[PDB]
């Protein structure tokens, strides 16, 4: 039903300006990186944001994929973030899949982006410190202005 509209290479940074990357175990993590470090570390730092449909109130229906040794797409299934081995779809039948996120700017702050899970309404991509690592997780939005669910998206 909905054909892919656009496909944008992107560097994604979290609330503390750390850059998202896929590690050798296919885990989404963040680390402090200059724009130079981010290029040095491609393709593990370069995310393909594929857009399928405007669905405001919630946002733009997108998938987020990365190409390293294989192409993986981000999934929020079971409220657990993972990279799933699959290509972004040419066409989606609807916007309900666990690989769909609604990308929306934070109201009033046009360059701060949120990514809301389609399949789990009110849950969002977030950065969270676990032990030594900074991880990409899915988090319930418990209050407004939670910077951990806000990102910078740089076009490439």
């Amino acid at each position: 039903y909905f054909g892919k509209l656009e496909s944008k290479l992107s560097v994604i940074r979290n609330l503390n300006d750390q850059v998202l990357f896929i590690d050798q175990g296919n885990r989404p993590l963040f680390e402090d990186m200059t724009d130079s470090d981010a290029r040095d570390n491609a393709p593990r730092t370069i995310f393909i944001i594929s857009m399928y449909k405007d669905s405001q109130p919630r946002g733009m229906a997108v998938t987020i994929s990365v190409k390293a040794e294989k192409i993986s797409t981000l999934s929020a299934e079971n409220k657990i973030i993972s990279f799933k081995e699959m290509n972004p779809p040419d066409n989606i039948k609807d916007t309900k899949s666990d690989i769909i996120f609604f990308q929306r700017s934070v109201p009033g702050h046009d360059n701060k982006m949120q990514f809301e899970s389609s399949s789990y309404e009110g849950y969002f991509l977030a950065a969270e410190k676990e032990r030594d690592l900074f991880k990409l997780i899915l988090k319930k939005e418990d209050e407004l202005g939670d910077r951990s669910i806000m990102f910078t998206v740089q076009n490439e």
């Epitope: 609330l15 109130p57 919630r58 109201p107 009033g108 702050h109 701060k112 309404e121 009110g122 319930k140 939005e141 418990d142 209050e143 407004l144 202005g145 939670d146 910077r147 951990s148």
Partner: antibody
Framework: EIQLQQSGPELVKPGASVKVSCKAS????????IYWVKQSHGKSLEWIGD????????SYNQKFRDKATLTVDQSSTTAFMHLNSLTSEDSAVYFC??????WGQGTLVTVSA | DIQMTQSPSSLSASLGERVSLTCRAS??????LYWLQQEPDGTFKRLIY???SLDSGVPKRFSGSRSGSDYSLTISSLESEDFVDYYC?????????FGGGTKLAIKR
């Protein structure tokens, strides 16, 4: 304990300006925006604006964008709202909040000559 | 801007009664609604977030639901402390906007 501690009630003259403060404690200040809300007799609750304490970015209700100026002081983990050009219509209780979840106790501002 | 029409602005009821307050949004806000309670001294407490999630430390008699562009806060059985003010708030779009409030009063 998450706390937002607001400054005391103010009595201020029409045409003057006032600056009210909102001291945050019990969490990492720069992880959450601070919101400001006006409660009046005449217009009930109105959102004024917000601020990102990490970079100072602000958003306003267009009704209040030339009335209110939001700032923070990172070191003291305090948010401020400055109101200019005061009139009787600015008399109200002003609240700060984290997340529109945790709220300050409010600051009454009375404008009178 | 999105207008949140909150009704009724006053509701008279009795201890033990089940009551429901409603907020109607002028545009689609999805699940992006809070319900707030305010005590007489001005203290706010959030009750419900994201339409139907109950905050911690809120009595279980409070619940939130949606049916269409109507959002409701239901109190299953009123207690004395419940006869205060209530407001909804939408966060779908800027500027964030509040309902005009409901005061819960004692019937006589």
């Amino acid at each position: 304990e998450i706390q937002l501690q607001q400054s005391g009630p103010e009595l201020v003259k029409p045409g003057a300006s006032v600056k009210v403060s909102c001291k945050a404690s019990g969490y990492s200040f720069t992880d959450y925006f601070i919101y400001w809300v006006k409660q009046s007799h005449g217009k009930s609750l109105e959102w004024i604006g917000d601020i990102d304490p990490y970079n100072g970015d602000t958003s306003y209700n267009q009704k209040f964008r030339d009335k209110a100026t939001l700032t923070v002081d990172q070191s003291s983990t305090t948010a401020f709202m400055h109101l200019n050009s005061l009139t009787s219509e600015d008399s109200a209780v002003y609240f700060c909040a984290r997340g529109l979840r945790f709220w300050g106790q409010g600051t009454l501002v009375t404008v009178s000559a | 801007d999105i207008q949140m029409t909150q009704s009724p602005s006053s509701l008279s009821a009795s201890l033990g009664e089940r009551v429901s307050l409603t907020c109607r949004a002028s545009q689609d806000i999805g699940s992006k609604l809070y319900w707030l309670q305010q005590e007489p001294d001005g203290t706010f407490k959030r009750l419900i977030y994201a339409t139907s999630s109950l905050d911690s430390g809120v009595p279980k008699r409070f619940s939130g639901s949606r049916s269409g562009s109507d959002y409701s806060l239901t109190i299953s059985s009123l207690e004395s402390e419940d006869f205060v003010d209530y407001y909804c708030l939408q966060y779908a779009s800027s500027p964030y906007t509040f309902g005009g409030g409901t005061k819960l009063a004692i019937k006589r």
